[model samples]
Target: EVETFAFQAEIAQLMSLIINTFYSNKEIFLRELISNSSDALDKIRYESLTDPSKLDSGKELHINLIPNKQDRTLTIVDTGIGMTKADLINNLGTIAKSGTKAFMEALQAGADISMIGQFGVGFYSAYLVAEKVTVITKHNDDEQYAWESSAGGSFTVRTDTGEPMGRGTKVILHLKEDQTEYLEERRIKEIVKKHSQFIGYPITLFVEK
Candidate 1:
């Protein structure tokens, strides 16, 4: 059965704050996402040490940035440990326990500003530029599933019957009316170099003339 849930009160409030105030530079959304992809790759790599089978025969650890101007969408795909249905619920449903409250408290207290993404709100930053976000992922032991939301208080997770994504996650961002700048190849390259240049994995951008 498809599972659905509403964001906790604190999470709802935190997302509101993030969409409206916490982030000033929208480009940082790409950085946050790439950082998350890198973390996922690192996790699976470590897991392979104990279970060599985790490293599938044809799977290569990499990140792909595909810009679809025709559809007004930008997709970020990573070969990493994908999310299970429960993972989708736990990671995206709740506020990471005290994470939301703690981040807000720190922001209100005017604490050090450099730790902006220390909390898990980095995922919501995608909403800053996209009207809707869709994630299709497959884990080693679970079936592929898709999670979608519009930064509204609720989200839905359903089984994905489309082509499997191997063992990773693919995040597709549907650009907002005013966020078309993200579709430009040059803009995407510049942002990746500026923010994600130091990332441990290779990030390739697919562009068309």
Candidate 2:
């Protein structure tokens, strides 16, 4: 059965802050996402240490970026520990537990914030350039699911019957009108190299010639 969840009032306000007041540098969204992918990869890799079967034998630990100019979308895929329904609700529905909104307020108050991942609000940063964000993920224990939102306080989670992702997460950003530059291969490569080159995993960009 599919379920729809609404972001708490506090979370809704926080999303507004993230979308509007947090980052003047909109391109930081890519860095934040890559950081999240790295963390997810790290989690699965660590899990594999205890139970080898927890890892997908066929999939390598890597990140993929597919840019489609026609659709004005950028998809970021990672072979990592995907989230279950509960995980999605817990992670995305509550901002107070993560303390991300608090940290963001501190940053707004002139706190010295060095890293984008410090507050765990990186996911919402996607709204800086996207009109909508969709996450399709599969966990070893849960069936494939898709979480979608427009940073508009309410998000919907539904079963995805599309091709199974095996075990990982795919994030698709529907670029905003002014943010279409992100759809360009050269632009994406420059941003990745500038912010995410130090990532431990390989980030492959798929672009049309």
RMSD for each of the candidates: 2.2, 2.2
Candidate 1 lDDT over residue span 110-192, tens digit each: 85323446876577778788888999988887889999888778878999998878898899999898898998989999999
Q: How many clashing pairs does model 2 include?
A: 0
Error of 1 at 85 (Å): 0.6
TM-score of 1: 0.91
C-alpha lDDT score of every prediction, in listed order: 0.81, 0.82
What tens-digit string does per-residue lDDT give for candidate 2 at 1-209?
Answer: 66778887766776686666645578888998888899889989999989888975335999999999888899999998888877887764224545665676777688633344577767877888898999998888888889999877788899998887989889999999988999888899999999998999999999775
> TM-score for every candidate vs. truth?
0.91, 0.91
Which portions of model 2 miss their true places by more than 4 Å? 92-98, 111-116
Poorest stretch of ten by lDDT in candidate 2 = 92-101
